[PDB]
Design a protein around this ligand. Structure first.
Ligand code: HEM
Ligand code: HEM
Ligand SMILES: CN(C)CCc1cccc(OCc2ccc3ccc(N)nc3c2)c1
Ligand SMILES: CN(C)CCc1cccc(OCc2ccc3ccc(N)nc3c2)c1
Ligand SMILES: C[C@H](O)[C@H](O)[C@H]1CNc2nc(N)[nH]c(=O)c2N1
Ligand SMILES: C[C@H](O)[C@H](O)[C@H]1CNc2nc(N)[nH]c(=O)c2N1
Ligand SMILES: [Zn+2]
Lengths: 407, 411
């Protein structure tokens, strides 16, 4: 019942008690581990609200106070009355920061308490949503000095009036299937790019076209909007060694802003909650540039380096992969856009992990996602045993809207 | 109950029915996942069902399930259990069990080779000296002048737990590690504790950076004895880099035979506590873990210096760059000397095919993603985007405690 975790690089052992407060389920059993699987009413709601309020008033040293009891009573009434309820501003802020704190797959959680929450719960329209988002993008970008942010649109009611951002990120490049049979732009965004056109987007069929926003308000039909270009900060990619690098014509955007997840606080469901931080270098360099199902430029880069691509054992893919990533980090830092390298990030996470064990009795962590997609064993998280479990408040996946939308 | 896994690079979906034959536990619950935890005397009362489960599998695989040969064997073993409180496997059974324990090793990326395992039956061995002789024959055969073959040597099963055969070494071939009074370590830090024991047990340590540890072998529960593997039997490869002439001057070499000897082989409830087995190295085992881990030879720095890398900011990725060159060197040195080795791209590639085939013909393939994915270049290998199901099948390779912690010393 009281679990321990060893770091096999440092012999350090932490003890985990926090997992005892786990509510949701993991996918695994005593018979089968699913750790590597990508995606594993009035009576329902009150205990959920109660759990949240209990941990909320506990965090502000007012557990069992009149304020506490009052609030429990107030929400109880509202639930019994309205079959839902509304979070105080303070609770909303707390829940959001804690949903990030509890994200077991996020290596960047040391920053968790420094989260800016924009309350867009008074939003009614897709134009409204667009305004709130533009403000989010401008705030978080900050001329390259990135600040973490979340913007929270109204909570789901009866699933009929859902707010949704259809884009997977606020800022992503377009993806077009070609007559050549290949794929122009971003392969991950092909199907989306179609629905954009299906709702009327005038695609400038290019390779690095910033997608339009496709916003759905109150369960209505989604609408298109173009993010003002001067709010979309981009970084031209150049190698601090290879002058020929720039000739590959690569850029990436500075703001990673995930906009397709569902934020759960005290049983309430926020289906539109776009949030942002800054990149870890490998996210663009390894996954965005080199993945087979993405911009897959490895061959080209290795070719220009004239590596021996005849045999896998020359490790030419490896050699290039590093250069590419060195450049990503190089450009971003040159242009003074915030970015973190996998070395610094993972180091910061081990620290945070120790802090959380010390100040909270645990830290749920998904090793499969915390270990960066390159140089794994030369970062400190590789030899860190981790425990994975689900705390609430939380960020959850949710179905792609087109599959769900009552049109 | 069916389970589907998906590959997110290729959208290939596979269905696992084999996990239904899972016996042992994973360490996980519905409330917690321990998939990244390193490590998550048996009565007749429980032995026969284990024997039966095993014998059933075995007779299915030879297509004689429910045959008379099958039933008499079940009767033979039953009778021998209540009679003798244990039982002996036929050779046919031992070979099968061993191949299958490998085949079930959910952490092993080299399993495509599982059926070509050479099994040496050392169950007639009675003494440490005998153990040495068997081991030498293993090393010689497995090595085969650089053309490595898979092998496992199997010593007598455990009985009352008081007469165990053990190989105290973690691997048959390994370099000594010596702690110095200034706190620094000469040799392989992973082996410091074990080196001390050897020295204590009488070993005369040359005290260099690459001393081949002596074998420390326990028979029938007796105190272990030292033996030196004949050097002519220990194949080694000097590490040089194909472009970098200064690399050879780093003074590095490694052995060619990865031969793990501290595990436990479980077949049909029988426990084989000394079962050294061997394959060949995937390059990153030496290149990434054995050299570049902070708790090992830790040559990243020196290689980086000699490359003239900006080691001032980690944002320079000097660690990454040097790590790759070192791995390039390891593969180069090995292939130059015609000593069998595999790179992580080829190995992970082969695994995916093995896996897909295992799903078709066996209805599943237990796989531990945390261990299958290589310690560098993870996402540019096909296994990274591969979803996997982890579960334990028997026969299996299990961990056991270090014998120096459990051994009752005779004197
Ligand atoms: C500020 C610096 C941040 C960094 C460096 C960072 C880094 C990362 C990385 C590397 C991943 C793995 C994704 C991949 O490998 O491509 C991840 C996942 C995740 N991040 Fe963080 N993040 C940051 C901020 C945030 C913020 C502000 C939030 C929300 C408030 C957040 C919530 C999450 C969640 C929920 C996941 C898991 C996504 C999933 O399950 O698919 N992160 N993050
Ligand atoms: C023949 C070529 C082989 C290759 C390339 C190979 C590769 C590997 C690698 C890279 C690992 C992970 C070790 C690490 O990450 O440091 C591993 C684990 C393992 N291998 Fe294989 N192996 C081979 C042969 C064998 C053989 C012959 C057996 C047994 C008969 C075997 C049984 C195992 C087991 C049980 C593990 C997991 C050990 C543990 O749980 O700690 N392997 N293998
Ligand atoms: C839904 N699946 C098809 C895709 C899931 C997936 C795949 C690859 C990376 C993912 O990361 C999501 C994610 C979420 C939040 C982030 C916050 C900051 C940051 N730098 N990256 C972040 C990345 C998710
Ligand atoms: C007990 N833990 C502290 C360490 C166990 C461990 C750690 C790292 C690698 C390990 O490798 C096991 C192992 C077993 C069999 C192998 C067969 C062939 C091969 N190339 N590597 C093989 C590797 C074991
Ligand atoms: C903490 C973690 O379980 C441990 O360090 C594991 C991680 N993954 C690994 N993966 C491989 N292939 N080999 C290892 O030794 C380890 N070590
Ligand atoms: C199959 C596997 O679950 C999937 O490819 C995961 C593996 N680990 C990952 N880890 C991170 N950080 N991001 C990812 O997208 C993935 N993908
Ligand atoms: Zn699990």
């Amino acid at each position: 019942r009281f679990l321990k975790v060893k770091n096999w690089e440092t012999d350090v052992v932490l003890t985990d008690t926090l997992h005892l407060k786990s509510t949701l389920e993991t996918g695994c059993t005593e018979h089968i581990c699913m750790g590597s699987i990508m995606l594993p009413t009035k009576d329902q709601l009150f205990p959920l609200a109660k759990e949240f309020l209990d941990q909320y008033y506990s965090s502000i040293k007012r557990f069992g106070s009149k304020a506490h009891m009052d609030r429990l009573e107030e929400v109880n009434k509202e639930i019994e009355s309205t079959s839902t309820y509304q979070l105080k501003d303070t609770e909303l802020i707390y829940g959001a920061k804690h949903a990030w704190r509890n994200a077991s797959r996020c290596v960047g959680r040391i920053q968790w308490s420094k989260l800016q929450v924009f309350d867009a719960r008074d939003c009614t329209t897709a134009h409204g949503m667009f305004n709130y988002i533009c403000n989010h993008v401008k705030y978080a970008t900050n001329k390259g000095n990135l600040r973490s942010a979340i913007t929270i649109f109204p909570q789901r009611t009866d699933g009929k009036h859902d707010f949704r951002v259809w884009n997977s990120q606020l800022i992503r490049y377009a993806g077009y299937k070609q007559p050549d049979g290949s794929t122009l732009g971003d392969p991950a965004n092909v199907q989306f790019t179609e629905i954009c056109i299906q709702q009327g987007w005038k695609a400038p069929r290019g390779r690095f076209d910033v997608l339009p926003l496709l916003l759905q308000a109150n369960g209505n039909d989604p609408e298109l909007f173009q993010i003002p270009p001067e709010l979309v900060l981009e970084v031209p990619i150049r190698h601090p060694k290879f002058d020929w690098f720039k000739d590959l014509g690569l850029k990436w955007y500075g703001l990673p802003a995930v906009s397709n997840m569902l934020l759960e606080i005290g049983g309430l469901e926020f289906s539109a909650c776009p949030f942002s931080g800054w990149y870890m270098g490998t996210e663009i360099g390894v996954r965005d540039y080199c993945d087979n199902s993405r911009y897959n430029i490895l061959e080209e880069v290795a070719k220009k380096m004239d590596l021996d691509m005849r045999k896998t054992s020359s490790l030419w893919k490896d050699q290039a992969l590093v250069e590419i990533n060195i450049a990503v980090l190089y450009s971003f830092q040159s242009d003074k856009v915030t970015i973190v390298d996998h070395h610094s990030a993972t180091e910061s996470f081990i620290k945070h992990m120790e802090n959380e064990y010390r100040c909270r009795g645990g830290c749920p962590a998904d090793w499969v996602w915390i270990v960066p997609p390159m140089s794994g064993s030369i970062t400190p998280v590789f030899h860190q045993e981790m425990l994975n479990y689900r705390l609430t408040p939380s960020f959850e996946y949710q179905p792609d809207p087109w599959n769900t939308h009552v049109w």
